[PDB]
């Protein structure tokens with residue numbers, strides 16, 4: 001996260017850090033708890049991943065330092081990538097992780113509500129992007145979960161900032177015309193929490209962007225609401 005600040009412990013209980021154990025354990029991507037056994041994240045986060053066996057999901061984490069060999073974690077039983085996904089920049093950057101065991105909800109870990117179709121007209125004025133990603137280009141995973149408030153921008157406005165790309169309605173962007181605050185390498189799969197009516201909503205999933213926090217280069221996110229039907233279909237046994 002660029003231009004952000006340290007999060008308060010438990011402030012974003014749906015945020016999880018997804019690790020890979022190969023070759024050695026390290027943070028790979030962010031993710032959001034949306035069910036007792038489901039993590040919603042980015043599909044482009046599994047590039048080079050042949051098996052869910054090397055994945056580990058940690059919930060209720062603030063500092064990566066809390067993660068040691070003796071720290072409990074959730075195994076991943078199955079990785080579900082949207083069948084239309086090809087690459088982050090083309091859209092459909094959405095994936096579901098089915099955990100091997102269920103998450104016991106607590107103040108440190110609980111699920112975030114998915115947006116409803118009857119909310120595409122809602123004016124989210126209080127949105128935040130969170131993660132352990134870079135604070136800039138060519139950096140490294142940060143220890144303390146970072147947070148940054150960032151305004152959503154219209155699709156028409158985002159398209160202007162990304163000529164050469166096709167910003168569809170299944171994407172949503174956010175950022176400052178002047179840059180300064182934004183997601184970065186490592187925040188991928190992270191949630192884009194929007195506070196609307198004393199209630200948090202998973203509006204987007206950190207997907208891509210040109211560089212990090214550059215001026216006139218909004219972060220691009222998966223427009224979650226466009227996938228509630230997909231999410232329902234894939235999570236029902």
Ligand SMILES: *[C@](=O)([C]([C][C][C][N]C([N])=[N])[N]C(=O)[C]N1C(=O)C([N])=[C]N=C1C1=[C][C]=[C]C([C])=[C]1)C1=N[C]=[C]S1
Pocket residue numbers: 028029044045047087088133182183184185186187188189206207208209210211212213218219220
């Ligand atoms: C991510 O967290 C990053 C976050 C980048 C978001 N940046 C801004 N300014 N909002 N995601 C990517 O690197 C995804 N990505 C791109 O954004 C671009 N421009 C080109 N390629 C990719 C990409 C696609 C598939 C696989 C990879 C490794 C990169 C991370 N996601 C994985 C590691 S860090």
